[PDB]
Amino acid sequence: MVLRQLSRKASVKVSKTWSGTKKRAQRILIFLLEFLLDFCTGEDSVDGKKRQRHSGLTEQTYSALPEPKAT
């Protein structure tokens, strides 16, 4: 209705339409280039988070379905 958080769709489809294209894109080009270099070297996302997004101890929801939670 009124609230239109672009962030909620940016988390799904992202859509870099105008979101950083006028000026940010000039370096996205370089980022694209160097990506090939760094990816060949190793990982660029040094995040040692285990599990998916939860360890699932008391999480006994045996749904196993693509349930639309919030994201």
Swiss-Prot record:
Positions of the UniProt region annotated as Disordered: 45-71
Q: Name one GO molecular function term.
A: DNA binding
Ranges of the Cytoplasmic topological domain:
1-27
Which stretches are Extracellular in the membrane topology?
A: 45-71
Which UniProt key words apply to this protein?
Host cell membrane, Host cytoplasm, Host endoplasmic reticulum, Host membrane, Host nucleus, Host-virus interaction, Ion channel, Ion transport, Membrane, Phosphoprotein, Signal-anchor, Transmembrane, Transmembrane helix, Transport, Viral ion channel
Q: Tell me the residues on which Phosphothreonine occurs.
A: 21
Please report the PTM annotation for this entry.
Answer: Phosphorylated by host PKC. Phosphorylation alters the stability and may also have an impact on the subcellular location.
BP-aspect Gene Ontology terms: monoatomic ion transmembrane transport
Localization of this protein: Host cytoplasm; Host nucleus membrane; Host rough endoplasmic reticulum membrane; Host cell membrane
Spell out which residues are annotated as carrying Phosphoserine: 7, 11
Provide GO CC annotations from the record.
host cell nuclear membrane; host cell plasma membrane; host cell rough endoplasmic reticulum membrane; membrane
The domain of life for this entry's organism is: Viruses
Q: How does it sit in the membrane?
A: Single-pass type II membrane protein
Q: Which sequence ranges are marked TM in the entry? A: 28-44
Tell me the subunit arrangement: Homooligomer. Interacts with VP1. Interacts with large T antigen; this interaction may impact upon the activity of T-antigen on the control of viral gene transcription and replication. Interacts with small t antigen. Interacts with host PP2A subunits for dephosphorylation. Interacts (via N-terminus) with host YBX1; this interaction modulates transcriptional activity genomic promoters. Interacts (via N-terminus) with host TP53. Interacts with host FEZ1; this interaction disrupts the association between FEZ1 and microtubules.
Q: What does this protein do?
A: Alters the structure of the nuclear envelope by interacting with host CBX5 and disrupting CBX5 association with LBR. Involved in the perinuclear-nuclear localization of the capsid protein VP1 during virion assembly and maturation. Plays an important role in the release of progeny virions from infected cells and in viral propagation, probably by acting as a viral ionic channel in the host plasma membrane. Allows influx of extracellular calcium ions in the host cell. May contribute to viral genome transcription and translation of viral late proteins.
User: What is stated as this protein's family in its record?
Assistant: Belongs to the polyomavirus agnoprotein family.
Protein name stated in the entry: Agnoprotein
Q: Write down the species.
A: JC polyomavirus (JCPyV)
Q: Give the classification, highest ranks.
A: Viruses, Monodnaviria, Shotokuvirae, Cossaviricota, Papovaviricetes
